[PDB]
Subunit: 256 residues, 4 copies
């Protein structure tokens, strides 16, 4: 099934997670052809500033994600930052997410694969599409079976990311490909939000196995990625649109 990974950027509170989870559950009931995966980070490990919000800890995070999976029966995904976190997180995460900056850390990938869960690696901003082949192989070596590669932009000069859509067909040669519509338009360190929907449309017209989107009831108040999180109320309309585009465009997806 087509994948839609969505949720608030950071686990600001179990409350926020349950509110977003409700809406995702509802959409889950509405779009049965789509496999929804609830996503949220228990820790923002590389905020620019030491004074910025990181989170409430792994334990509290796994707990809240457990509440979401229990209350709504939704699959879960969260990102790990050091090898030791793989196991505890795998208790609740159906898919373990590997941060873009850490996509080359062999030990992190192996610890993810060992848990037996699915692994979704965010393609580093410094990484060429063809060089993700080795990332996938490390994971296979470590016993991984369900492997995803997520396109999230590429370093383009300073404080800018460009999305090279040629990467989708290239990465598809060795893994299921996910398009990160949120982080692909943010400026590291223009007008971010206005480009999220247009690029999402491009991703499905080109061909991918799923889309990743951060969403918040009130993006304006988000403690992380405030400028790019999609207002929860707009999620349905966007999903309906990509399914329609996908339905027509899929006829032309090149074999691979």
């Amino acid at each position: 099934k087509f994948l839609v990974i969505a949720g608030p950027c950071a686990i600001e509170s179990e409350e926020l997670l349950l509110k977003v989870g409700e809406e995702i559950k509802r959409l889950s009931e509405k779009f049965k052809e789509v496999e929804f995966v609830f996503k949220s980070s228990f820790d923002k490990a590389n905020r620019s500033s030491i004074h910025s919000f990181r989170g409430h800890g792994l334990e509290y995070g796994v707990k809240a994600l457990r509440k979401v999976k229990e209350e709504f029966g939704l699959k879960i995904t969260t990102d790990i930052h050091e090898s030791w976190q793989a196991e505890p997180v795998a208790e609740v995460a159906d898919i373990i997410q590997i941060p873009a900056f850490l996509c080359g850390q062999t030990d992190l990938l192996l610890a993810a694969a060992k848990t037996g869960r699915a692994v979704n690696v965010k393609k580093g901003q410094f990484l060429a599409p063809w060089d993700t082949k080795n990332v996938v192989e490390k994971l296979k070596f470590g016993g991984a079976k369900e492997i995803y590669l997520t396109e999230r932009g590429t370093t383009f000069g300073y404080n800018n990311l460009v999305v090279d859509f040629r990467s989708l067909p290239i990465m598809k040669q060795w893994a299921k490909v996910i398009y990160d519509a949120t982080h692909s338009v943010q400026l590291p360190g223009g007008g971010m939000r206005e480009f999220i929907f247009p690029l999402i449309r491009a991703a499905v017209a080109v061909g991918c196995d799923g889309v990743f989107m951060e969403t918040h009831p009130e993006p304006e108040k988000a403690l992380s990625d405030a400028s790019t999180q999609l207002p929860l109320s707009q999620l349905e309309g966007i999903i309906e649109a990509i399914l329609e585009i996908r339905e027509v465009a899929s006829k032309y997806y090149e074999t691979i």
Copy 2:
């Protein structure tokens, strides 16, 4: 609104090659009535990498060949100019005067095209930020151009590589109609190539543009220029049908500028 499809062989190899592609384009224009087709071919490749590559058969010959195409098929014409003096003679036959990517900033060339009264299509330089096309349009308006197009053809990304930053489509749409060049955007000046033409063109129409530009040739492998990226003529119909379908389903979601 009528979607624009600019297509044709990269270079005017002969009047014969032109009439051949022209006939196929004429046929598709009869089928895709919702599309405005414009026949394209350069009378001169003014910046081949090597001094030993094919340039063309001259301005006079090119214009005459292009005139034959318009005459025989009733097709609109577009070709590119390389120096100011060429605008006048070229405007005799060209409905749209094209400005090469490297020359998108040359004021005199822009003014020369503008005062002919013809439409003007500027290829966005590989070095140019989407927001900096605003002044290129201003120059044209200042020069008398009433119909202006900006063509997305990729941006310098490291050495011998171009990337297409699709954010440029809605940015440039603020001041001109936008065309997506499906051929030159996948070329490696000096990823691979042809295998990416179709997927990137699908992305372009999903994002939203006013037209697409595609070089096509009966036998790409024998073309005297851009043999690697020129689309096989027989594949044109399918590509066009596909983009009209994607455009239609995506259209209700195009943002308002």
Copy 3:
């Protein structure tokens, strides 16, 4: 001899040219080991804005440059923008300059070579160093004998240029290499001026055949490139510095 190409960006007036020419003449007398070339554009053919200063015309420009060469006996260089301008300009220009954006225009290069003068091509911002081989060959084909390639930065994301110093040894394989210290730090369309001297030092430590620098009595009032033109009073100090660095570093210039 080591080359130093300097002068005001645009021929704002014969007056300005003579004032800058005087100082350049003086430095010419002071640094006999250096071949000074007076540079100034009779036309700024690609200003961002239609309302910006372009110049006073080719005729007036060639006239003023003639006054400089006559009054101070300094060699001359100016840039052409269309093929027809090569011949009239070659009457006074010892070196014909090919704009960076036009470095691939075969007809412009051939018209430059035909005049018999020296040709200095500004490496396009889109051009890889190894791809300048073909530029040089076009010129040789057209009869050019004294050929220079000028490093002036490379497109690095939007509105930014980076200087890849690997380009100097690479281009030296087929032409004399000049480093443009002025345009290499400007932001197309950070803090420009503060980086001019540091990068100039790098260029000579690496190894080049000359340096290109725009200078103005009062950069602040320049009608073109106001933010990057070097104050005339600082030129001597910079030249003395690059000669000293060159004297020590030249011992290590790799053979080629």
Copy 4:
């Protein structure tokens, strides 16, 4: 001020390789008394492209080998950490804890290095703008680091290529001492390579930095990692003499931060 030269084999292939390079570095430290030499070698290559490449002989083995070097030659030591828990044991022997380029933003790793009391050298990420290293330094100061270095090792430039934007040297100098990594800056992740090490290092000292980082190996072609860019041990002396000479003549022109 004492110029820093950080050098050594890329990976701790064996305690024997270490003592060999160590002896040469000890010898140069006796000749170049105006230089502070720091012996470098990774106990682990935590991010080889392939799962089949050499990683190392483990933390315990590495630290012990590095300790032997410090013990036998009285040389300062530096090595890189990959996870927070490694900072403490590594600080036992390392005078400078190095933070890998890809991890330059990992707050916990930075804090872990900072609280050891050792000096900290951060490799500037290939994705990081020079001005964004300011917050990396802030994190370290916050964590207790009193001696901080930022290492220039190139920036992503298209695919499989890095460019060195020398404007970064004076920018980063605003908040930390700066080191130029002569080895990794010419590497093509995943121009050519070794032929550019020396020229770029000359540019670095002409611009101005507080030290240079260079991987050297008795026989580069046999190294288990970075064989292509590791400098032949016999060439180290000459490279160092050359940069001290260029540094000296350029020094009076170094701008004040």
